[PDB]
Design a protein around this ligand. Structure first.
Ligand code: HEM
Length: 149
């Protein structure tokens, strides 16, 4: 897992994200949808958004971006003991939204990229290493919960 020092790096960086959740969330979704168009197909909600420029202008996309990062923040703040937060998310994402684990890898990469872009000093090698481990743990535990369902 992660050391307390590593968790501390993660949560300090996350505090910077919390300053502008909608801005960060919108950019994560844009990178996801543009980088991997197959992911946009899982969202009937955003079916009319056909370009990066349209995505950037959509208040609704920004709103959902905020929802995603708020939920992720809740999980991160529980450090290594996050089963209660992961369970319902695994349930909805497996059974209703039908989200493969690969797509969780894609959104993890998008998150890292956005953090690099918005926080070039603060999000250095050590912070990036720790955040990568934290997102890997999230993915592994989502995947494990998928199997229990
Ligand atoms: C960081 C990882 C993610 C988090 C924290 C997250 C969080 C959430 C939350 C809290 C909701 C609303 C409640 C629910 O239905 O579960 C939601 C809905 C949804 N999620 Fe995710 N999600 C993540 C990744 C993904 C990915 C990668 C996809 C698809 C590629 C996806 C597809 C969807 C869809 C289609 C909905 C319903 C949206 C709507 O029609 O309003 N999720 N997600």
């Amino acid at each position: 897992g992660l050391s307390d020092g590593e968790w501390q790096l993660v949560l300090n960086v996350w505090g910077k994200v919390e300053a502008d959740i909608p801005g960060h969330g919108q950019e994560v979704l844009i990178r996801l949808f543009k980088g991997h168009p197959e992911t946009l197909e899982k969202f009937d909600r955003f079916k009319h958004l056909k370009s990066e420029d349209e995505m950037k202008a959509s208040e609704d996309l920004k709103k959902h971006g905020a929802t995603v990062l708020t939920a992720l923040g809740g999980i991160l703040k529980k450090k290594g003991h996050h089963e209660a937060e992961i369970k319902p998310l695994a349930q909805s994402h497996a059974t209703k939204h039908k989200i493969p684990v690969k797509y969780l890898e894609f959104i993890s990469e998008a998150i890292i990229q956005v953090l690099q872009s918005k926080h070039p000093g603060d999000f250095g090698a050590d912070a990036q290493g720790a955040m990568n481990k934290a997102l890997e743990l999230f993915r592994k535990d989502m995947a494990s919960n998928y199997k229990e369902l």
